[PDB]
């Protein structure tokens, strides 16, 4: 059965900084396999630590690099002889942030739309709701003001990031936070 995978304090990590990835399940897995899909694929075998009905494993990144950025998935290890692994956890993107110029972010029951703008020719824009592990992405279009943009329809605290095609897990500096109330 599918374990849970989270990032502490969060998944948007500055260069050379720290993040802890936690795998956990109520199924008592002896081991966990933390897979990374990115510019440098890898699998990390983690000891399943057992306490009061839960099996947990931490993978600490002590210094964030491009090699460690990617989409992570956690699997619980079931058996060794009839080799079996569980269903993967929900995917978690661990991104390097703060690499480029910060974009600008502009704003009961009404449709709110948030816009990501910069003069830099970012290929993708990323919207982040603080505290929420998953981010929304949208391509950038050019405007007659010499500024690239992306509008995110919401239908919390928000931050905006830009990235390039050849490095999808290397984002810009976060925009100033925009509180939506």
């Amino acid at each position, epitope marked *: 059965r599918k374990p849970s995978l989270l990032a502490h*304090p969060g998944p*948007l990590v*500055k260069s050379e*900084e720290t993040v802890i990835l936690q795998c956990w399940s109520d199924v008592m897995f002896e081991h966990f396999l933390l897979h990374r899909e990115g510019m440098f694929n890898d699998t990390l075998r983690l000891i399943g630590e057992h306490h009061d009905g839960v099996s947990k494993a931490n993978f600490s990144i002590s210094r964030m690099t491009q090699d460690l950025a990617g989409t992570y998935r956690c699997y619980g290890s079931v058996t060794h002889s009839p080799y079996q692994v569980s269903a993967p956890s929900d995917p978690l993107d661990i991104v390097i942030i*703060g690499l480029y110029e910060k974009p600008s972010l502009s704003a009961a029951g009404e449709n709110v739309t948030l816009s990501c703008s910069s003069r830099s020719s970012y290929d993708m824009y990323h919207l982040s709701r*603080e505290g929420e592990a998953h981010e929304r992405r949208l391509p950038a279009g050019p405007k007659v003001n010499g500024t690239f943009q992306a509008d995110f329809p919401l239908g919390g605290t928000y931050r905006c990031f830009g990235s390039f095609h050849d490095s999808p897990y290397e984002w810009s*500096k976060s925009s100033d*936070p925009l509180l939506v109330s």
Partner: nanobody
Amino acid sequence: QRQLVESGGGLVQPGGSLRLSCAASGRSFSDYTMGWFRQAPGKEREFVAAISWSGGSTYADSVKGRFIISRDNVKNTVYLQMNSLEPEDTAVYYCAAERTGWSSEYDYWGKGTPVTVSS
């Protein structure tokens, strides 16, 4: 999310010491990296020290060995113990917070506390 309030600033003689405090009144305090910055007359605002969500400290080389940063996650407070103060340390001292894991910036700032090392 945050509102930071500094205190403890004042007049001090060279070689003296001073302890600054910063009260933070927001949710998830223990998860923020807290920093101290300073702006001397005619200079740009500069980093002095930071204390990570994990408790790890970082210092500007100009302050290394003389200042100590600490945090209290029960009281939601940050401290800057400033020892062996020289007139070069005269500046407005600011407390700042970074939502590590969600932002690359110190988005939250206090209004400052003035520190003057006379003569």
